Write an enzyme that holds these catalytic residues in place. Structure first.
Site, short mmCIF file in Angstrom:
data_model
loop_
_atom_site.label_atom_id
_atom_site.label_comp_id
_atom_site.label_asym_id
_atom_site.label_seq_id
_atom_site.Cartn_x
_atom_site.Cartn_y
_atom_site.Cartn_z
CG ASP A 1 -1.83 1.17 1.33
OD1 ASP A 1 -2.28 1.46 2.45
OD2 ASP A 1 -2.12 1.81 0.30
CG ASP B 1 -4.15 3.91 -2.33
OD1 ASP B 1 -5.22 4.05 -1.70
OD2 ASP B 1 -3.18 3.23 -1.94
C1 LIG Z 1 -4.93 7.62 2.91
C2 LIG Z 1 -5.93 6.47 2.69
C3 LIG Z 1 -6.95 6.90 1.61
C4 LIG Z 1 -5.23 5.19 2.21
C5 LIG Z 1 -5.97 3.82 2.32
O1 LIG Z 1 -6.24 3.59 3.67
C6 LIG Z 1 -5.04 2.72 1.72
O2 LIG Z 1 -4.85 3.05 0.38
C7 LIG Z 1 -5.39 1.17 1.62
C8 LIG Z 1 -5.51 0.43 2.96
C9 LIG Z 1 -5.77 -1.11 2.95
C10 LIG Z 1 -7.23 -1.49 3.30
C11 LIG Z 1 -7.32 -2.99 3.71
C12 LIG Z 1 -6.19 -3.93 3.14
C13 LIG Z 1 -5.54 -3.45 1.80
C14 LIG Z 1 -5.34 -1.90 1.68
N1 LIG Z 1 -6.64 1.07 0.78
C15 LIG Z 1 -7.99 1.27 1.09
O3 LIG Z 1 -8.45 1.58 2.19
C16 LIG Z 1 -8.92 1.01 -0.12
C17 LIG Z 1 -10.06 2.04 -0.27
C18 LIG Z 1 -9.68 3.27 -1.04
C19 LIG Z 1 -9.23 4.41 -0.51
S1 LIG Z 1 -8.87 5.61 -1.70
C20 LIG Z 1 -9.35 4.54 -3.03
N2 LIG Z 1 -9.33 4.84 -4.41
N3 LIG Z 1 -9.75 3.36 -2.50
N4 LIG Z 1 -9.55 -0.29 0.07
C21 LIG Z 1 -9.72 -1.12 -0.99
O4 LIG Z 1 -9.37 -0.86 -2.14
C22 LIG Z 1 -10.39 -2.47 -0.64
C23 LIG Z 1 -9.28 -3.47 -0.27
C24 LIG Z 1 -9.83 -4.74 0.32
C25 LIG Z 1 -9.99 -4.85 1.72
C26 LIG Z 1 -10.51 -6.03 2.30
C27 LIG Z 1 -10.87 -7.12 1.47
C28 LIG Z 1 -10.71 -7.02 0.06
C29 LIG Z 1 -10.19 -5.83 -0.51
N5 LIG Z 1 -11.13 -2.97 -1.80
S2 LIG Z 1 -12.72 -2.38 -2.12
O5 LIG Z 1 -12.65 -0.98 -1.86
O6 LIG Z 1 -13.06 -2.86 -3.41
N6 LIG Z 1 -13.90 -3.06 -1.04
C30 LIG Z 1 -14.22 -2.20 0.13
C31 LIG Z 1 -15.28 -2.83 1.06
O7 LIG Z 1 -14.83 -4.14 1.46
C32 LIG Z 1 -14.61 -5.04 0.38
C33 LIG Z 1 -13.57 -4.43 -0.58
#
Ligand SMILES: CC(C)C[C@H](O)[C@H](O)[C@@H](C[C@H]1CC=CCC1)NC(=O)[C@H](Cc1csc(N)n1)NC(=O)[C@H](Cc1ccccc1)NS(=O)(=O)N1CCOCC1
Length: 333
Positions: free
Chosen positions: A31, A219
Site C-alpha cells: 500500500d 494508491d
Molecule cells: C490515505 C488512505 C486513503 C489510504 C488507504 O487507507 C489505503 O490506500 C489502503 C488500505 C488497505 C485497506 C485494507 C487492506 C488493503 C489496503 N486502501 C484502502 O483503504 C482502499 C479504499 C480506497 C481508498 S482511496 C481509493 N481509491 N480506494 N480499500 C480497498 O481498495 C479495498 C481493499 C480490500 C480490503 C478487504 C478485502 C478485500 C479488498 N477494496 S474495495 O474498496 O473494493 N472493497 C471495500 C469494502 O470491502 C470489500 C472491498
C-alpha cells in the site's frame, strides 16, 4: 529486487513476505497509501472470524522476535485494525530487514473476511506512519544496496490461466519488460505523501470535473479509482450509473458504449477506456455491470482528494521516486 504479485479478480494484488526465524509466511498488499506493516496475530481472539481465516504470526515460534508491545490502531478508508508492535526480521524478495510491525488482535469480519490476503506492507513515507515506526522501504534503503531510491508497480489484468503473473513490484528501479515509451513524472505536492496535483478530469467532450485543479493520491492499495462523494455523484450521473451498496453499476449492454475518462496529470492526458474501468461480465440489458470507481472521502490534511488505484495502475506502469519526490507513469505492457 522484485516481488511477484497475485491478482485476485482485479481487485486484490498481493505478494508474499516471510517473518521470523524460521520464516512465517504471509500474503500482504503493498500500500503506497499507508506506511505501517501489519499481519494478523496469533494473539488475536478467535471470536474474530477473520483471524480464523488468515495466517497468524506466532511470536513464540520465532527465535528472532523482539518484543515491544506498544498498542496501535491503523485506520484505513475501508476498514480498521488494532493491535500492538513487535520487531522481527522480514524477507521481501530476497532482501532481509529487521522491521517493526503490528501484530493485529482485532480484525473486523467486514471487510477482512473478503480478503484473499493476510496483511499489509505500507509503502508510504514515515510522515504517515502511525506510532512513528520506520517504514519498511526506508529500512531497506538504509542498507544502501538498492541501485536506486525508487520502487515500481506493475498490475496485470486478471487472466484465467494461472501461468501469467498477476503483478510485479520492483524494489530499487523498474522492469523495462512491463512498460513502453518514456516515463512522465509529476512532482509530489505535500511532503511525505504519494499525492500529486491533478489538473483536470474529463468524461468525453466535457472537462466537467476537477476544474480549477484537485489532488490525486496514487494508491497501490486501492482496488478502484476514487473521488469525493460529490465528484463521484457527478461523474456517475454523466455515465448513467446507479448506486447500489457503496459502489456503482451500469446495465451491462451499456458498458461498451460508455465514454473515455481522462486524468490531466503534469500536462498529459491519461485516458481510461470503458473496457478499462467497467467489469464487463455480460452484455445483457438484464444484468448489472460494476464500475471500478467509487466514492471515498479521505479526511484532511491528505484529503479531500481523488485516488488512483488498480483501475488506473493497470494501464499505466508506476514508478515511485523517493529521491526526487516524484511519480512517473508509462504505458503498461
Ligand atoms: C490515505 C488512505 C486513503 C489510504 C488507504 O487507507 C489505503 O490506500 C489502503 C488500505 C488497505 C485497506 C485494507 C487492506 C488493503 C489496503 N486502501 C484502502 O483503504 C482502499 C479504499 C480506497 C481508498 S482511496 C481509493 N481509491 N480506494 N480499500 C480497498 O481498495 C479495498 C481493499 C480490500 C480490503 C478487504 C478485502 C478485500 C479488498 N477494496 S474495495 O474498496 O473494493 N472493497 C471495500 C469494502 O470491502 C470489500 C472491498
Amino acid at each position: 529486487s522484485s516481488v511477484i504479485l497475485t491478482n485476485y479478480m482485479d481487485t486484490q494484488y498481493y505478494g508474499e513476505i516471510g517473518i521470523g526465524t524460521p520464516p512465517q509466511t504471509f500474503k500482504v498488499v503493498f500500500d503506497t497509501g499507508s506506511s505501517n506493516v501489519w499481519v494478523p496475530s496469533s494473539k488475536c481472539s478467535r471470536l474474530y472470524t477473520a483471524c480464523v481465516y488468515h495466517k497468524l504470526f506466532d511470536a513464540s515460534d520465532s527465535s528472532s522476535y523482539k518484543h515491544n508491545g506498544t498498542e496501535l490502531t491503523l485506520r484505513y478508508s475501508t476498514g480498521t485494525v488494532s493491535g500492538f508492535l513487535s520487531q522481527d526480521i522480514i524477507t521481501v524478495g530476497g532482501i532481509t530487514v529487521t522491521q517493526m510491525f503490528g501484530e493485529v488482535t482485532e480484525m473486523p469480519a467486514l471487510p477482512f473476511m473478503l480478503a484473499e490476503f493476510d496483511g499489509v506492507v505500507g509503502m508510504g513515507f514515515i510522515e504517515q506512519a502511525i506510532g512513528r515506526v520506520t517504514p519498511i522501504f526506508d529500512n531497506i534503503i538504509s542498507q544502501g544496496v538498492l541501485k536506486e531510491d525508487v520502487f515500481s508497480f506493475y498490475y496485470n489484468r486478471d487472466s484465467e490461466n494461472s501461468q501469467s503473473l498477476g503483478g510485479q513490484i520492483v524494489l530499487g528501479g523498474s522492469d523495462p519488460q512491463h512498460y513502453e515509451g518514456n516515463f512522465h513524472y509529476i512532482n509530489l505536492i505535500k511532503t511525505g505523501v504519494w499525492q500529486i496535483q491533478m489538473k483536470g478530469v474529463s468524461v468525453g467532450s466535457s472537462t466537467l470535473l476537477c476544474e480549477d485543479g484537485c489532488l490525486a493520491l496514487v494508491d497501490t492499495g486501492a482496488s478502484y479509482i476514487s473521488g469525493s462523494t460529490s465528484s463521484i455523484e457527478k461523474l456517475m450521473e454523466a455515465l448513467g450509473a446507479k448506486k447500489r451498496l457503496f459502489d456503482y453499476v451500469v446495465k451491462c449492454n451499456e458498458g461498451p458504449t460508455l465514454p473515455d475518462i481522462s486524468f490531466h496529470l503534469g500536462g498529459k492526458e491519461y485516458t481510461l477506456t470503458s473496457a478499462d474501468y467497467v467489469f464487463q461480465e455480460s452484455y445483457s440489458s438484464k444484468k448489472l455491470c460494476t464500475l471500478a470507481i467509487h466514492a471515498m472521502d479521505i479526511p484532511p490534511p491528505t484529503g479531500p482528494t481523488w485516488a488512483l488505484g488498480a483501475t488506473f495502475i493497470r494501464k499505466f506502469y508506476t514508478e515511485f521516486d523517493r529521491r526526487n519526490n516524484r511519480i512517473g507513469f508509462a504505458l503498461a505492457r
